[PDB]
Amino acid sequence: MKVILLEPLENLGDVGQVVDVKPGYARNYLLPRGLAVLATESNLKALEARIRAQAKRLAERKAEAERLKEILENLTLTIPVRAGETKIYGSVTAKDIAEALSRQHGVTIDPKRLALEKPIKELGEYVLTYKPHPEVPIQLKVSVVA
Amino acid sequence: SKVCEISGKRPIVANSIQRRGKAKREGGVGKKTTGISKRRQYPNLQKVRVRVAGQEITFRVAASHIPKVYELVERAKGLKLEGLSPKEIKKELLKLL
Amino acid sequence: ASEVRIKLLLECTECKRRNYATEKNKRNTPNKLELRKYCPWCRKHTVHREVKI
Amino acid sequence: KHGKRYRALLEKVDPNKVYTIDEAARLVKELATAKFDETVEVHAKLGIDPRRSDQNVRGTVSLPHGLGKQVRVLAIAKGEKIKEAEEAGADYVGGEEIIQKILDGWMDFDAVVATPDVGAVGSKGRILGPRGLLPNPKAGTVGFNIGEIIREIKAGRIEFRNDKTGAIHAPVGKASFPPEKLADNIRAFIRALEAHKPEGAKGTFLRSVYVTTTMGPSVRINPHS
RNA sequence: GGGGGGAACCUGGGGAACUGAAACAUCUCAGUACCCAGAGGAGAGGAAAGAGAAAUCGACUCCCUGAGUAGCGGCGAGCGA
RNA sequence: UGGUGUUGGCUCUUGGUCGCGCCUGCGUAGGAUAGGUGGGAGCCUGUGAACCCCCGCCUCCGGGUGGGGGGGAGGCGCCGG
RNA sequence: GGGCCUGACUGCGAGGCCUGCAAGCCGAGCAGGGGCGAAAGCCGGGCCUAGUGAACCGGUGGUCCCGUGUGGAAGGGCCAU
RNA sequence: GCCCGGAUAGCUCAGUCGGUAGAGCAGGGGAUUGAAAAUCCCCGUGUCCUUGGUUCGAUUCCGAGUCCGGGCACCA
Ligand SMILES: [Zn+2]
């Protein structure tokens, strides 16, 4: 199945490209996420002359990924929660940290864009990647306390 | 398992034909049938949940017609479906057929 | 008949057509029999090799 | 690990580039840097099994434009075939006592042909054979018109016979033949095998067709062009 | 606009067994009985991606014939264009 | 219960496929390890030598193998055998 | 018991016996081509009467008969089995 | 019926990715011996199952086949 990549993909390629992926991956993962489009002749036709626009909005992702990158690199977020001497009685997630930047710091990031492979259960400082734009990894210091 | 919501493939009535012996083509004396009994072949229906107009719509569609529904989804983009409920939305997408 | 006394044909050595069917005791005669039989196809007597029936 | 007369030839070759019968023939003589008239060789790969002892592409073709090479027919013939073999190109007659002229140690020829009446040539044979020179009518080298045979023997007539590694081997001429002269030289072996295809085979009858010269580099050439 | 009813008559979905095979399982009974849905005074079918041997015909439906023929068949019973 | 659809992504490893790049081939004889099938009387190194050392492979123990360094214009070849 | 030989034949078959049928049995003679024999002659298995099983289905070889528009082929038919 | 294993000396087996048929065996061709023992020996010997080919030669390598041992499958 052919699809028009709406983004640069590490295992697929880049926006504007039409690759062949099995129906499960794009059809359940990519299309609903808007990561790409089906390869219909209509979308092939409109494909031309939009890749300029598509890379335009993509470049917007680069720009706000930059002014937001430099803005959020130099700050540590603290998480006021209820935890033990060696254990967090609750848990933190991506949307949690987004809530912390929003209600506590006011900055607005995307929770899903944030990387969280394990909701934290221990205290202390943490450094994590965000990556708003492809090939744009952003570490970040979040502090969890009681 | 009922019809395919798009193709309308209903279950069919087929025969279980239990045979025996070697086929004539293989030098066998001939496939002696040991017994026939009715059965029903069912469509391989599946659930197809799709986000149209902020709504989730489920389609018990044949697997062979899975992508077809997505066509309708894209074909729905020339439509004004909000803020209709999933009943009217589904009836409209069927109207696209 | 027996597993020791088997059936057999007699191909003509020349027309190559099995013109006769007979039997032998393969115990006694472990050799392919060969006998001048009238080949109707060849239309004349001709040595016939014992062919596996 | 190679020669500056040869590495400089590998300098001017592209390993995976597709070449045609005309284009590569331009390349066969231009990279002919060996210090004599090289041999333009169309080394093709046949798509057949020699172990399948019916896919034996054993034949010949009198290539147009000759070959530029030397063919010396040690002719075997007697009874009015002596003198008609002595003429029309052959020079080694003869004509049946010359088998006794095979010591062996007398290898001043390049081919040996004998009429169908002999006969007394197959047995004596044992050393005339192991160098691939036993006169066999499968490829040219036997016939009552032994003089007629040698007439086209001298006319650059190559033999072809597939080997254990599914390969067939007959060069199209010397390094003195231009790409347009070799162009008939080249195709005269390809289409010579297009008709000698032993029917019954999986896949293409021609895996690949490469062209090297005497000491020269190989050449990835495209057949049927 | 629909609902529901309508003797039989029609499709469309489902669909038996007894019985015959002098047993019986393939098969036949029979796509019948019956059930369900739908209509309509009819229904269906209907304008060739047909027929099939003539370069032949020319949507469809039904009658006779083809023909118990071609055929199918534990090559049986039978069925049967 | 195995294939398959539904049903995807990453990677770890294994069995094929084809690329390629390489090495690999030994009665006697023949210097030596001769895989065939074609041309070959010529080749090579200042797009650095026979030589010496080092390194690994094969190694049939005769040897070859490929890579480095001194070396670096000295080796062979059909023909000899 | 010895000699040679394979008639333990091909195509057939007057006639008969037996018999519900079907089966079963005897066979002159004729032709092809042979065996033995001088020939006369005999030889179409065995001194005889048991040693066996209809049809269907299918296999194997010959056949070249049919081959679904045509040529092939699939597939069958027929012969042997 | 298909697929699996084997066929090599008078036997069992080895058996170059073809340059060699061999290990033992049975003996014996010999010599001792009136006979016969221990004995000497080279070993004797063999299509490496048959049919054709690869080959600069083919037990090998290849196609076909035969027989045998085995499994699987049908059985009118
Ligand atoms: Zn005959």
Side-chain angles (χ1 to χ4, degrees), chain B residues 22-41:
Chain B
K22 186 183 289 184
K24 293 183 188 291
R25 188 179 70 187
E26 295 175 352
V29 66
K31 299 297 289 182
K32 295 293 188 293
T33 299
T34 194
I36 294 170
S37 66
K38 280 186 177 291
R39 54 85 57 82
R40 294 179 71 187
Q41 290 183 356

mmCIF file of all heavy atoms in Angstrom, chain B residues 22-41:
data_model
loop_
_atom_site.group_PDB
_atom_site.id
_atom_site.type_symbol
_atom_site.label_atom_id
_atom_site.label_comp_id
_atom_site.label_asym_id
_atom_site.label_seq_id
_atom_site.Cartn_x
_atom_site.Cartn_y
_atom_site.Cartn_z
ATOM 1 N N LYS B 22 -8.458 -42.039 -3.387
ATOM 2 C CA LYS B 22 -7.536 -41.290 -4.222
ATOM 3 C C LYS B 22 -8.254 -40.761 -5.452
ATOM 4 O O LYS B 22 -9.120 -41.430 -6.019
ATOM 5 C CB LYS B 22 -6.372 -42.179 -4.641
ATOM 6 C CG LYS B 22 -5.285 -41.466 -5.400
ATOM 7 C CD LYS B 22 -4.219 -42.456 -5.820
ATOM 8 C CE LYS B 22 -3.423 -42.927 -4.617
ATOM 9 N NZ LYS B 22 -2.308 -43.829 -5.005
ATOM 10 N N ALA B 23 -7.887 -39.556 -5.866
ATOM 11 C CA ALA B 23 -8.482 -38.977 -7.057
ATOM 12 C C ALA B 23 -8.079 -39.766 -8.292
ATOM 13 O O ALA B 23 -7.000 -40.361 -8.351
ATOM 14 C CB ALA B 23 -8.055 -37.522 -7.214
ATOM 15 N N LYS B 24 -8.965 -39.769 -9.291
ATOM 16 C CA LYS B 24 -8.650 -40.444 -10.543
ATOM 17 C C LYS B 24 -7.399 -39.862 -11.174
ATOM 18 O O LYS B 24 -6.585 -40.597 -11.747
ATOM 19 C CB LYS B 24 -9.816 -40.339 -11.520
ATOM 20 C CG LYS B 24 -11.069 -41.077 -11.118
ATOM 21 C CD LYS B 24 -12.110 -40.947 -12.218
ATOM 22 C CE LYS B 24 -13.464 -41.506 -11.811
ATOM 23 N NZ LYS B 24 -13.486 -42.980 -11.659
ATOM 24 N N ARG B 25 -7.223 -38.544 -11.073
ATOM 25 C CA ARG B 25 -6.069 -37.908 -11.694
ATOM 26 C C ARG B 25 -4.766 -38.441 -11.124
ATOM 27 O O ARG B 25 -3.765 -38.530 -11.841
ATOM 28 C CB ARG B 25 -6.135 -36.396 -11.521
ATOM 29 C CG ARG B 25 -5.065 -35.682 -12.318
ATOM 30 C CD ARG B 25 -5.133 -34.179 -12.161
ATOM 31 N NE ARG B 25 -4.739 -33.751 -10.825
ATOM 32 C CZ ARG B 25 -4.840 -32.502 -10.383
ATOM 33 N NH1 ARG B 25 -5.322 -31.552 -11.173
ATOM 34 N NH2 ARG B 25 -4.455 -32.202 -9.150
ATOM 35 N N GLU B 26 -4.761 -38.809 -9.849
ATOM 36 C CA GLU B 26 -3.604 -39.422 -9.221
ATOM 37 C C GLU B 26 -3.590 -40.929 -9.388
ATOM 38 O O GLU B 26 -2.969 -41.629 -8.581
ATOM 39 C CB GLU B 26 -3.571 -39.066 -7.739
ATOM 40 C CG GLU B 26 -3.378 -37.597 -7.482
ATOM 41 C CD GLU B 26 -3.481 -37.260 -6.014
ATOM 42 O OE1 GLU B 26 -3.848 -38.159 -5.228
ATOM 43 O OE2 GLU B 26 -3.198 -36.101 -5.644
ATOM 44 N N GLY B 27 -4.274 -41.447 -10.401
ATOM 45 C CA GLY B 27 -4.436 -42.873 -10.544
ATOM 46 C C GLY B 27 -5.436 -43.487 -9.596
ATOM 47 O O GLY B 27 -5.705 -44.688 -9.702
ATOM 48 N N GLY B 28 -5.998 -42.707 -8.680
ATOM 49 C CA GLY B 28 -6.949 -43.250 -7.738
ATOM 50 C C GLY B 28 -8.234 -43.692 -8.405
ATOM 51 O O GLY B 28 -8.614 -43.227 -9.477
ATOM 52 N N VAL B 29 -8.924 -44.615 -7.734
ATOM 53 C CA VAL B 29 -10.154 -45.178 -8.273
ATOM 54 C C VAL B 29 -11.296 -44.179 -8.298
ATOM 55 O O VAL B 29 -12.321 -44.439 -8.934
ATOM 56 C CB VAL B 29 -10.549 -46.424 -7.457
ATOM 57 C CG1 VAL B 29 -10.904 -46.032 -6.040
ATOM 58 C CG2 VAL B 29 -11.693 -47.171 -8.122
ATOM 59 N N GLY B 30 -11.155 -43.043 -7.627
ATOM 60 C CA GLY B 30 -12.202 -42.046 -7.657
ATOM 61 C C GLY B 30 -12.640 -41.616 -6.277
ATOM 62 O O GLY B 30 -12.790 -42.445 -5.379
ATOM 63 N N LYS B 31 -12.861 -40.322 -6.097
ATOM 64 C CA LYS B 31 -13.169 -39.779 -4.780
ATOM 65 C C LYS B 31 -14.573 -40.206 -4.387
ATOM 66 O O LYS B 31 -15.560 -39.580 -4.775
ATOM 67 C CB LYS B 31 -13.040 -38.264 -4.792
ATOM 68 C CG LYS B 31 -11.656 -37.776 -5.132
ATOM 69 C CD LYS B 31 -10.676 -38.235 -4.095
ATOM 70 C CE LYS B 31 -10.897 -37.499 -2.801
ATOM 71 N NZ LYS B 31 -9.904 -37.914 -1.776
ATOM 72 N N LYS B 32 -14.670 -41.281 -3.618
ATOM 73 C CA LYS B 32 -15.949 -41.677 -3.048
ATOM 74 C C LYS B 32 -16.346 -40.689 -1.966
ATOM 75 O O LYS B 32 -15.634 -40.529 -0.972
ATOM 76 C CB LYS B 32 -15.866 -43.086 -2.476
ATOM 77 C CG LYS B 32 -15.631 -44.152 -3.511
ATOM 78 C CD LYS B 32 -16.832 -44.262 -4.417
ATOM 79 C CE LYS B 32 -16.701 -45.450 -5.333
ATOM 80 N NZ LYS B 32 -15.596 -45.243 -6.299
ATOM 81 N N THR B 33 -17.477 -40.024 -2.156
ATOM 82 C CA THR B 33 -17.974 -39.114 -1.140
ATOM 83 C C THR B 33 -18.445 -39.900 0.071
ATOM 84 O O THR B 33 -19.201 -40.866 -0.053
ATOM 85 C CB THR B 33 -19.118 -38.276 -1.686
ATOM 86 O OG1 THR B 33 -18.650 -37.502 -2.794
ATOM 87 C CG2 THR B 33 -19.643 -37.350 -0.617
ATOM 88 N N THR B 34 -17.988 -39.495 1.251
ATOM 89 C CA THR B 34 -18.418 -40.175 2.459
ATOM 90 C C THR B 34 -19.591 -39.490 3.131
ATOM 91 O O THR B 34 -20.286 -40.132 3.923
ATOM 92 C CB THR B 34 -17.275 -40.294 3.466
ATOM 93 O OG1 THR B 34 -17.641 -41.231 4.485
ATOM 94 C CG2 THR B 34 -17.031 -38.970 4.124
ATOM 95 N N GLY B 35 -19.840 -38.219 2.840
ATOM 96 C CA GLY B 35 -21.055 -37.612 3.347
ATOM 97 C C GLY B 35 -21.131 -36.111 3.189
ATOM 98 O O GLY B 35 -20.120 -35.422 3.307
ATOM 99 N N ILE B 36 -22.323 -35.589 2.937
ATOM 100 C CA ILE B 36 -22.528 -34.160 2.755
ATOM 101 C C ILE B 36 -23.459 -33.660 3.842
ATOM 102 O O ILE B 36 -24.447 -34.322 4.175
ATOM 103 C CB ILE B 36 -23.115 -33.839 1.372
ATOM 104 C CG1 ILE B 36 -22.118 -34.191 0.277
ATOM 105 C CG2 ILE B 36 -23.524 -32.386 1.295
ATOM 106 C CD1 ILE B 36 -22.713 -34.124 -1.101
ATOM 107 N N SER B 37 -23.154 -32.487 4.386
ATOM 108 C CA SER B 37 -24.034 -31.868 5.364
ATOM 109 C C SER B 37 -23.953 -30.359 5.233
ATOM 110 O O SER B 37 -22.869 -29.809 5.038
ATOM 111 C CB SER B 37 -23.674 -32.290 6.790
ATOM 112 O OG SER B 37 -22.398 -31.799 7.155
ATOM 113 N N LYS B 38 -25.098 -29.695 5.344
ATOM 114 C CA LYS B 38 -25.118 -28.255 5.177
ATOM 115 C C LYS B 38 -24.297 -27.555 6.248
ATOM 116 O O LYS B 38 -24.103 -28.048 7.359
ATOM 117 C CB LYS B 38 -26.542 -27.708 5.204
ATOM 118 C CG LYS B 38 -27.308 -27.860 3.914
ATOM 119 C CD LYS B 38 -28.644 -27.153 4.019
ATOM 120 C CE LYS B 38 -29.417 -27.219 2.719
ATOM 121 N NZ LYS B 38 -28.766 -26.392 1.668
ATOM 122 N N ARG B 39 -23.813 -26.380 5.879
ATOM 123 C CA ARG B 39 -23.127 -25.470 6.778
ATOM 124 C C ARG B 39 -23.348 -24.073 6.234
ATOM 125 O O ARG B 39 -23.967 -23.890 5.185
ATOM 126 C CB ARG B 39 -21.641 -25.812 6.899
ATOM 127 C CG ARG B 39 -20.909 -25.903 5.577
ATOM 128 C CD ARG B 39 -20.432 -24.553 5.089
ATOM 129 N NE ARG B 39 -19.565 -23.892 6.052
ATOM 130 C CZ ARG B 39 -18.271 -24.148 6.172
ATOM 131 N NH1 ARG B 39 -17.699 -25.048 5.385
ATOM 132 N NH2 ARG B 39 -17.548 -23.501 7.072
ATOM 133 N N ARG B 40 -22.831 -23.085 6.946
ATOM 134 C CA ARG B 40 -22.943 -21.704 6.511
ATOM 135 C C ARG B 40 -21.554 -21.101 6.456
ATOM 136 O O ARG B 40 -20.793 -21.199 7.422
ATOM 137 C CB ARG B 40 -23.853 -20.902 7.438
ATOM 138 C CG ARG B 40 -25.292 -21.356 7.389
ATOM 139 C CD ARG B 40 -26.185 -20.563 8.325
ATOM 140 N NE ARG B 40 -26.406 -19.195 7.870
ATOM 141 C CZ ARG B 40 -27.033 -18.265 8.584
ATOM 142 N NH1 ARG B 40 -27.496 -18.554 9.790
ATOM 143 N NH2 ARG B 40 -27.199 -17.045 8.095
ATOM 144 N N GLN B 41 -21.219 -20.501 5.324
ATOM 145 C CA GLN B 41 -19.974 -19.764 5.192
ATOM 146 C C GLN B 41 -20.214 -18.334 5.645
ATOM 147 O O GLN B 41 -21.139 -17.669 5.165
ATOM 148 C CB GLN B 41 -19.454 -19.810 3.757
ATOM 149 C CG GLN B 41 -18.960 -21.179 3.337
ATOM 150 C CD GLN B 41 -18.388 -21.192 1.941
ATOM 151 O OE1 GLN B 41 -18.419 -20.187 1.238
ATOM 152 N NE2 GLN B 41 -17.847 -22.329 1.536
#
